[PDB]
Amino acid sequence: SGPVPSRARVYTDVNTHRPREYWDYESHVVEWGNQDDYQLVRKLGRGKYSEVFEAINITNNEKVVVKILKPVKKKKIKREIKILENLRGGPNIITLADIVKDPVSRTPALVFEHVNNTDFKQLYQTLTDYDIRFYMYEILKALDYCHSMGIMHRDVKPHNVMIDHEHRKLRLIDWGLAEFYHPGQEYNVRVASRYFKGPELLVDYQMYDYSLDMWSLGCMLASMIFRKEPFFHGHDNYDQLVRIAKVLGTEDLYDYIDKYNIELDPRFNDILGRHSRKRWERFVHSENQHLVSPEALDFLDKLLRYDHQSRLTAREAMEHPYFYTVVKDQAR
Ligand SMILES: CC(C)=CCOc1cccc2c1-c1c(c3c(n1C(C)C)CCCC3=O)C2=O
Ligand SMILES: [Cl-]
Ligand SMILES: [Cl-]
Ligand SMILES: [Cl-]
Ligand SMILES: [Cl-]
Ligand SMILES: [Cl-]
């Protein structure tokens, strides 16, 4: 008797009901454009797997953004392209415009529609209480959408959110780690950045689902309302789970482990030890007092749960009272 199986609470079969070509990205044949249509203007930034440029389409003189992919497995390029194509046109999802390949070096590059925005990590430590709620809600729109389309983002973090703060616009970017959810499928746990990895990743439970993204969202919320960047500041992968356990307590962690019959590393179990749960108000200070409300703490508590199946879905989050006034002014 190994680990207990798990299934997503919502959107479980959305890919099952789709035609195979929707999610079988390996069979998909990529129709590449002409790189000559694009000339690079200047550098915008650089990820771990890409270099990002401002560019111009010399066929309609439109501004675009080009993301030149650093060499990874060809299977990962088709997955990212297929996911971006499936999500194209969704609320707050970056819009893929074209796919091009270098004539000589054969390096693939993604072409996106240009939006004069800035990175969320440069803003999210200075927002008003209402602005935290507002942009959290826009992030949730993107996550509920992509989850409803059968896709887990798996790398939700401040650096992967873009803000056009003058137009109050938001985009969820970097779909290079995203995957299609299929019930019963076992997934790789080497996803997400350390500070935003869910406990299922840290204990090597492979049958996870969309709820992984909700843990990452909870880490972002905690960082914003408490002004602690990151909130769980683990120094290696084991220490990341220790930091979590020093907050949520070890009791609910071991219940989670036992619930899914997860075999933990012998020395790891002794590493975790015993820690009581800390009240969320223990992290409130005089300088983040204006950002912390009872509804904020109740919402955060309902995202940061060890048991991935107990976390709020994206739609349940959007109906949490924490967004009540945000939702009311969404009608103007
Ligand atoms: C205005 C500033 C500060 C940057 C413009 O950042 C943009 C703009 C439009 C579209 C994208 C990015 C961007 C993307 C991506 C990244 N960046 C940034 C962080 C360079 C990081 C690597 C992964 C990725 O995918 C991406 O798709
Ligand atoms: Cl980040
Ligand atoms: Cl599998
Ligand atoms: Cl995977
Ligand atoms: Cl910490
Ligand atoms: Cl969801």
Query: Does the beta carbon of 3 sit less than 6 angstroms from any atom of ligand 1?
Result: no
Q: Tokens 């509804």 map to which residue?
A: 295
Q: How many residues does the chain have?
A: 332
Phi and psi at 115, nearest 5°, equal: -135, 125
Residue pair 211/308 in contact by the 8 Å Cβ criterion: yes
The best mutation among 42, 67, 88 to test binding of ligand 1, ranked by most ligand atoms within 8 Å of the C-beta, falls on: 67
Q: Which residues make Cβ contacts (< 8 Å) with residue 143, sequence separation at least 6?
A: 153, 156, 172, 210, 213, 214, 217, 314
Query: Which ligand is nearest the CA of 185, by number?
Result: 3
Residue 75 CA to ligand 4 centre (angstroms): 11
Residue 15 CA to ligand 6 centre (angstroms): 14
Q: Which residues make Cβ contacts (< 8 Å) with residue 86, sequence separation at least 6?
A: 22, 149, 151
Resolution as reported, in Å: 2.0
CB atoms within 10 A of CB 110: 23
Nearest to 224 by CA among 325, 122, 324, 126: 126
Q: How was this structure determined?
A: X-ray
Residue 250 CA to ligand 3 centre (angstroms): 30
Q: Which residues hold their Cβ within 5 A of ligand 2, which is an ion?
A: 157-159
> Looking at residue 320, what DSSP letter applies?
S
Phi and psi at 106, nearest 5°, equal: 60, 20
Two tokens, residue 27: 């069979």
53-61 own/partner pairs: CB under 8 Å, 24+ apart: 54/114, 55/111, 57/111
Q: Which residues are annotated as a binding site?
A: 44-52, 67
Distance CA(260)–CA(263), nearest Å, equals 9
Q: Which residues make Cβ contacts (< 8 Å) with residue 165, sequence separation at least 6?
A: 117, 118, 123
Which residue(s) pair with 139 in the sheet? none
Q: Which residues are annotated as a binding site for ATP?
A: 44-52, 67
Query: Does the beta carbon of 234 sit less than 6 angstroms from any atom of ligand 1?
Result: no
Going from the N-terminus, what domains does the chain have, and what CATH number goes with each?
A: 6-23+115-332 (1.10.510.10), 24-114 (3.30.200.20)
Residue pair 9/313 in contact by the 8 Å Cβ criterion: yes
> Looking at residue 133, what DSSP letter applies?
H
Residue 174 CA to ligand 4 centre (angstroms): 16
Q: For residue 71, say if its preceding peptide bond is cis, omega within 30 degrees of 0.
A: no
DSSP 295-319: HHHHHHHHHS-SSGGGSPPHHHHHT
Two tokens, residue 102: 């270098």
Question: Would you say the C-alpha torsion 284, 290, 294, 300 has a positive or negative sign?
Answer: negative
Q: Tokens 């392209």 map to which residue?
A: 81
Nearest to 178 by CA among 139, 212, 128, 207: 212
Q: Which residues make Cβ contacts (< 8 Å) with residue 279, sequence separation at least 6?
A: none
In one letter, which amino acid is 7? R
Bridging pattern class, strands 161-164 and 50-57: unpaired
CB atoms within 10 A of CB 107: 15
The residues assigned a catalytic role are: 155
